[PDB]
């Protein structure tokens, strides 16, 4: 299925070629995520005149406007108090909106769609570093402790 692109992609396409993907890849993922638009002829001529440089490069500059809000977390080191047992043994480990809204009051306006955890749901006690892909290109890196309440 021939389709033209709107963001770059995590793969083969680079904003302006019309790659031929399988029909499930376009219909279920690319078009509702706004990373593509189907390549009928009325959209191909919509691409070269309207799309190709006007606000297609609104996206990359707004990515670069987020590539410093990438590092508007100048502290990257937030501890969260939740009651535990003696010697570790947490009652309930913090999740990912439990860490997104933790950094909301202490830095960046981030929801849990943008938080990526390497190892589970951070069950234990100690300074562990949770990754942050608010951005599509490069992650951000935030150290987090959890102590007993």
């Amino acid at each position: 299925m021939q389709v033209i692109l709107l963001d770059k992609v995590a793969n083969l396409g680079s904003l302006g070629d019309q790659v031929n993907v399988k029909a499930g890849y376009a219909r279920n993922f690319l078009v509702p995520q706004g990373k593509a638009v189907p390549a009928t002829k009325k959209n191909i001529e919509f691409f070269e005149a309207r799309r190709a440089e006007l606000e297609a490069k609104l996206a990359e500059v707004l990515a670069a406007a987020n590539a410093r809000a990438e590092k508007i977390n100048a502290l990257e080191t937030v501890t969260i108090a939740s009651k535990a047992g003696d010697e570790g043994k947490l009652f309930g480990s913090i999740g990912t909106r439990d860490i997104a809204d933790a950094v909301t009051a202490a830095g960046v306006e981030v929801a849990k769609s943008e938080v990526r955890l390497p190892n589970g749901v951070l069950r234990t006690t100690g300074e562990h570093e949770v990754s942050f892909q608010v951005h599509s290109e490069v992650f951000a890196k935030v150290i987090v402790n959890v102590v007993a309440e």
């Binding site: 299925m1 029909a23 219909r27 078009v31 509702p32 189907p38």
Partner: protein, 77 residues
């Protein structure tokens, strides 16, 4: 009922012709599936009970152009 909301396929009938040509009645059911479709204009998901051929029509015509004529036939997606 088992009708595609786009094309309007219906469960037609036929025969089960055996090897010795014994005709027994049967039914052909039209491959229906419920599928959420992302309409870009309305900025939402519309769930339609379509056949598999109906998805190709929505992948050939516009979704909203297809959904324009479901409005014209008095369908209520």
């Amino acid at each position: 009922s088992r009708v595609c909301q786009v094309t309007g396929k219906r469960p037609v009938t036929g025969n089960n012709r055996s090897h010795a040509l014994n005709a027994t009645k049967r039914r052909f059911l039209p491959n229906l599936h419920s599928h959420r479709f992302w309409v870009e204009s309305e900025k939402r998901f519309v769930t339609l009970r379509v056949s598999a051929k109906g998805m190709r029509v929505i992948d050939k015509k516009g979704i909203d152009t297809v959904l324009a004529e479901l409005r014209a036939r008095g369908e209520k997606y």
